[PDB]
Amino acid sequence: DHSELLVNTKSGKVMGTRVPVLSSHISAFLGIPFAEPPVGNMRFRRPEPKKPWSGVWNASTYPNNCQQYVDEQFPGFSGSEMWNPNREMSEDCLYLNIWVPSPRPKSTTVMVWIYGGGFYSGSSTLDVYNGKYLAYTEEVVLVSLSYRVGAFGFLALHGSQEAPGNVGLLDQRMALQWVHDNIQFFGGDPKTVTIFGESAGGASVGMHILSPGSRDLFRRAILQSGSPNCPWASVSVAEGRRRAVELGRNLNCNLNSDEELIHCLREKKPQELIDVEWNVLPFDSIFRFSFVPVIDGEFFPTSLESMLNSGNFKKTQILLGVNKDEGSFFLLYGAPGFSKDSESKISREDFMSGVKLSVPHANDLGLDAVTLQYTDWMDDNNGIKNRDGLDDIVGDHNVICPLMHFVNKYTKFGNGTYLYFFNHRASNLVWPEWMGVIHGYEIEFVFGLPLVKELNYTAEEEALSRRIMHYWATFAKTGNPNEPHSQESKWPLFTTKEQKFIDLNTEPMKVHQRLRVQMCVFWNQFLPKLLNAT
Amino acid sequence: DHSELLVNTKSGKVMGTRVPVLSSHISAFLGIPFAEPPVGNMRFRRPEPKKPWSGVWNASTYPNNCQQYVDEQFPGFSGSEMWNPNREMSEDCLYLNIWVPSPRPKSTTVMVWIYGGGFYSGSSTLDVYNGKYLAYTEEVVLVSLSYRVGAFGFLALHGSQEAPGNVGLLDQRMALQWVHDNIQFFGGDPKTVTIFGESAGGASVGMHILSPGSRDLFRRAILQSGSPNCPWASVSVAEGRRRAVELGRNLNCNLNSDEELIHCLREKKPQELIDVEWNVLPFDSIFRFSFVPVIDGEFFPTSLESMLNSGNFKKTQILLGVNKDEGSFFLLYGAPGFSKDSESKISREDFMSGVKLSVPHANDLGLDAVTLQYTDWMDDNNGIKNRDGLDDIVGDHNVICPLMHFVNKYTKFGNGTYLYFFNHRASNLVWPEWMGVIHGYEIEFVFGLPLVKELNYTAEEEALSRRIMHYWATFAKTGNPNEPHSQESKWPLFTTKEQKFIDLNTEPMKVHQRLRVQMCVFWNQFLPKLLNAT
């Protein structure tokens, strides 16, 4: 050994950089490779492990982001623009980032972040995913992995071994492997690794909890606004086949064999794949993505619901939750009548339209039930109600009810569940009032940005961020977000019988029960039963 | 002419009796025949008109009640016992009763009452149907007809002319004919006849509004807690056939022809028919009756819904409404978990049971939708909620939503609609708190019993009765329950656009809109659509 910023791993040596944080400093190691570049012929394949290197890998700057579609709806607007790649995209994007306390701990708690973005987008290197605040403030080692999104990560021709499906998940698995293997050298305790993530990252987390090949490589888990059974999170192998074929068909490929097709898709430049990515969708829809995990028989041995039922999953502690207004962002981008700069009150006819796109797989009787459950018939041309009703349809259907079924099935077999409902709307939020508490807007609180005065949060917003960070980290370190025998208010355990949960906001903690049961009984029991019979 | 109590009609002379009322007196003519006894061979046939008589028919005492099943669930208990025949039953029961002001008016407004009782029971002669208070207080001529209930009134073998169906309705028609023809001699104005009725009588009223052969014989109409499209009010000709056959089968009849069967059913004593009346029902159910009107092609030319749609009905003014807790009486008598002497809180499993019996014609997905619409899933073992939820299911499904669809269809084509929601619970009510405001308990207020001090109502209950009687009679006399240019609060007209209605109770009038729309959209639009597809 020689110095604080030089760490030797099983893959080689690695030189970090000293990084400032809230009038102190910590070490940071950025863009460490954990896989061979999945380039040329390796596109669509499994990740291979990174060949070890001689010399000193310079880990002082963030790596390239994976190739992905780029938001251009509000150019220069920070609200949308903060989610885009802030680094040059490249297929050579399988790297991770480590923030580490100064001085180097010996065996501290590890937290590994898994970004969202519908499995079609996402970056480890964004500002909101910066781990220096969490690492500093809570004394954890913070890791952010990456994984291939889009067709590059999720094109599935089941049966073929060139493009099996799921490889973006295997990407994440392998970075977890790499942490299990090397994190001790950074002072991490590999027996005490929490994976955590939001959206597609929250569903990923749950996917690793479900998948055998992934369960041994982490200790605990946090799922934010996503769960592995969301209707957008996975597709049958038949559906993925259809879609890969349809992709080939948009690029004038030979389709008569897996071999010809893959060969063709591999001839292509990345942006050509992205240019037609969205055209493979079976339905006109929102909150649906083209290349997602497949239920293959390997990564997932059986269907998800049967795995949840039969207890076939890792049994450990989990902490998860949702945000008040999960759906708003989807309707803004994808639904008639919603604009960023307007109150977006919605005609009844735009309502009808919205429902159709929000529950794409529904026959007419379906749409009638969904519409009936969500319409105050005493006051049905209220455009605020129509607006807000549809907001809720999207979030209930896509995020909250799937998470709530996940929770109920998991807690039968598990060892501890802590549920939250995050409903603070930030004082500095650039988006309009109507979108409420938006998909992804608990993140900044999880990653500590309210402590950075220049980002202009309130003090009570700072205080909520420190509270949340300490819930998240205490939980990662112990299986419980509460600190033993302390005067603070207690986040009760969530149990099959009483179903408790807490709001997360600036007001004194309040405990509640049965998070959106009424609606989620509609989405999780009745609707599905109705579409099965008809 | 000779005296106040001797009236000469087209059928003969008739001697009334002078009857006391609230420290005054009026004339009354009871048990005047309007049809030949439908006895022996005439059983199940059309009514023939009464052969005129010589001499002076003694109209001083009530007639016989029609043959009918008799309530014995609470023997001696006045609550149930006040609905039973208070006169000897006989098949020779086609008579009417007339209360007339003293002195005899020359051309006053006429009101003709049509009793309820599921078309299986009812009497013109009950205490609550006594017209002397209404006649005296409001200066109307009050008529009460009767009609055959049970198989005697409603056995249907469509195609046959011995037992066509519907004859109990023709009974009522004929008493209306008789009023059109003779009421002038009692000082009634035959151009100004309101028919009115409750339950099966309310549905009858609407049935005469719908039926061509009946529409010319009245001016206006009031429907209390019933409407002609209630699901218990009518059956197909196939269903009525099945049921008449099944009746024969319970009495060991020959079933190979209409002729043999009818011959057989006519051999029988009345009580034999009543003894097995209830065994013909297709389903285990509540709020369902064995012999009811059939949709025959004659009395009703086409199906009810098509008649309502196409405007094929009498266009005049109507005044109608419902009571807060229509269903309670049905669940008391017919549903597990409900007792007269208990708070009747209901297990969830008794709930399930209740729903099954309340919506008999529902497949499992039906029962799931009904259960979902009516269960607070935040608090689902609340036995008061389960009790009250099912109360509402019965009243919504059977009384309120059918009336609300009737109203909406009628008001497109009609000339004035006045809707009420009667929700006063009487201070002297003998039934328990939980049954709330019960099916048939607006009647006593319509017939003025609160003015009779010895019945122990409050003064504000007296005042509500006088108010209601004057709404009912002003409406019969004018087409509007409101008196021109008067300081009183105004019962607004009910219109397609704004759907207004008033509560009827002791508190100052309150106007509302859209009576149980949310539920009735479930019952009138969605549920039926759901059972049609599945």
Ligand SMILES: O=C(NCCCCCCNc1c2c(nc3ccccc13)CCCC2)c1cccnc1
């Ligand atoms: O560029 C276009 N569409 C881009 C669609 C990509 C959307 C990226 C999503 N990024 C977000 C993400 C999250 N929340 C958001 C909240 C508000 C806005 C964006 C959020 C949370 C999960 C990570 C991504 C386009 C298409 C057609 C016409 N005009 C623009």
Ligand SMILES: O=C(NCCCCCCNc1c2c(nc3ccccc13)CCCC2)c1cccnc1
């Ligand atoms: O006798 C039995 N059941 C009789 C069923 C007949 C029910 C007659 C209905 N009479 C009522 C009627 C109305 N409201 C009522 C409210 C409370 C109670 C009775 C009401 C209003 C419409 C006219 C009839 C019986 C059956 C089996 C076991 N125990 C008793």
Ligand SMILES: *[C@@H]1O[C@H](CO)[C@@H](O[C@@H]2O[C@H](CO)[C@@H](O)[C@H](O)[C@H]2NC(C)=O)[C@H](O)[C@H]1NC(C)=O
């Ligand atoms: C999680 O699992 C642990 C052990 O697998 C549980 O701890 C045990 O609880 C049982 C039942 O009360 C006790 O008899 C044992 O003594 C406990 N073992 C240990 C080592 O403490 C624990 O209850 C589970 N926690 C939850 C929240 O389900």
Ligand SMILES: *[C@@H]1O[C@H](CO)[C@@H](O[C@@H]2O[C@H](CO)[C@@H](O)[C@H](O)[C@H]2NC(C)=O)[C@H](O)[C@H]1NC(C)=O
């Ligand atoms: C009921 O019908 C009568 C006539 O059939 C309506 O009275 C007419 O209303 C029209 C339209 O406003 C006027 O132009 C006529 O002058 C009225 N005729 C008479 C004789 O007054 C009445 O509007 C209808 N009422 C309701 C409540 O629909």
Ligand SMILES: *[C@@H]1O[C@H](CO)[C@@H](O)[C@H](O)[C@H]1NC(C)=O
């Ligand atoms: C590491 O690389 C960066 C970025 O290109 C550079 O600024 C820095 O000086 C480098 N340091 C070493 C030791 O290579």
Ligand SMILES: *[C@@H]1O[C@H](CO)[C@@H](O)[C@H](O)[C@H]1NC(C)=O
């Ligand atoms: C009318 O009949 C009743 C009842 O049977 C009787 O009390 C009364 O005296 C009779 N009067 C006449 C005139 O027949």
